[PDB]
Write a protein that binds this ligand. Structure first.
Ligand SMILES: Cc1cn([C@H]2C[C@H](OP(=O)(O)O)[C@@H](COP(=O)(O)O)O2)c(=O)[nH]c1=O
Ligand SMILES: [Ca+2]
Length: 129
């Protein structure tokens, strides 16, 4: 897999963000994770976490997996990075997302994220508290 450039257009919530990619606006949904909706417990914390990570970043990149690159809603499916740090992983490590939506053929970083979820659970962080 490889990283490609994008720029932030707007934070949306914990697991979706509006980025410009190959010069076009797109909503990206983060692969392999599920944040609470804003209206749910830890939703506002998840939104804030992703917003801060994306806005503070000097460099945003997206990394598509081997399979589908857009979902049935026209959302781009990617791993997102802020200054080299994967947002998907960071959310899970902080207990602000669960590993979820692991479809065959778009699951390259599954075990990395499960290891992060285990550590968040051990620490009883946020959604595991
Ligand atoms: C993360 C992800 C979601 N989806 C679809 C599955 C779910 O369909 P349904 O809407 O019918 O539940 C929805 C969950 O996204 P959200 O968590 O953003 O709601 O997005 C994919 O198709 N591929 C994916 O990789
Ligand atoms: Ca969600």
């Amino acid at each position: 897999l490889h990283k490609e450039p994008a720029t932030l257009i707007k934070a949306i919530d914990g697991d979706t963000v509006k980025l410009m990619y190959k010069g076009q606006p797109m909503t990206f949904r983060l692969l392999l994770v599920d944040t609470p909706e804003f209206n749910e417990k830890y939703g506002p914390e998840a939104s804030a976490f992703t917003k801060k990570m994306a806005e503070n970043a000097k460099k945003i990149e997206v990394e598509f997996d081997k399979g589908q690159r857009t979902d049935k809603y026209g959302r781009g499916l990617a791993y997102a990075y802020a200054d080299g740090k994967m947002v998907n992983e960071a959310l899970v490590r902080q207990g602000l997302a669960k590993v979820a939506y692991v479809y065959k053929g778009n699951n390259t970083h599954e075990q990395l994220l499960r290891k992060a979820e285990a550590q968040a659970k051990k620490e009883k962080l946020n959604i595991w508290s």
